[PDB]
Design a protein around this ligand. Structure first.
Ligand SMILES: [Cl-]
Ligand SMILES: [Cl-]
Ligand SMILES: [Cl-]
Ligand SMILES: [Cl-]
Ligand code: NA
Ligand code: NA
Lengths: 99, 99
């Protein structure tokens, strides 16, 4: 797809078999969801930095599908204002910024 | 240009005549800098939401140049961990996310 930026760029994504909406966020290193029930085992992971740490769950080797692009990636679960697709997943689907 | 996402997408920009590095951030509604000396007058703007509201400075009709594309747009000055080019500026230069 070719995604314009007039509104926040949400897409439908299937993650760990769960169908969700998430924002394509070139400002985020990692992909993170709240309110999801993923398969498999998780380990805790610290993200953020001083003044803004967050302890989240990290699920690895999770199947992710966006617009028919099927990849396997890491997915964090924890507090986030919106679900976020970060660079780590966007690089696997071959996404680019163009202008 | 066409920019891949293996690294954070920093670009050189000239904003209000000031040469800076800033991150192309599709998860940001607004372009925002800390530490910049913009021309003209500013008005207060409320930003944020659930995590907290804060008043920042809004400069309007500011010249912005990125990769030879010249536009005029809004630039906020307030706390941010990185200089950000948000969707408002990216829409004016015709940027899209593609995969
Ligand atoms: Cl959702
Ligand atoms: Cl980087
Ligand atoms: Cl800079
Ligand atoms: Cl305030
Ligand atoms: Na400078
Ligand atoms: Na102005």
């Amino acid at each position: 797809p070719q995604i314009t930026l007039w509104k926040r760029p949400f897409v439908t994504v299937k993650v760990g078999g769960q169908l969700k909406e998430a924002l394509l966020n070139t400002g985020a290193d990692n992909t993170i969801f709240e309110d999801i029930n993923l398969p498999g085992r998780w380990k805790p992971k610290m993200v953020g930095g001083i003044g803004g740490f967050l302890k989240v769950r990290e699920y690895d080797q999770v199947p992710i599908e966006i617009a028919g692009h099927k990849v396997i990636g890491t997915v964090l679960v924890g507090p986030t204002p919106v679900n976020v697709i970060g660079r780590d997943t966007m690089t696997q689907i071959g996404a680019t910024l163009n202008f």
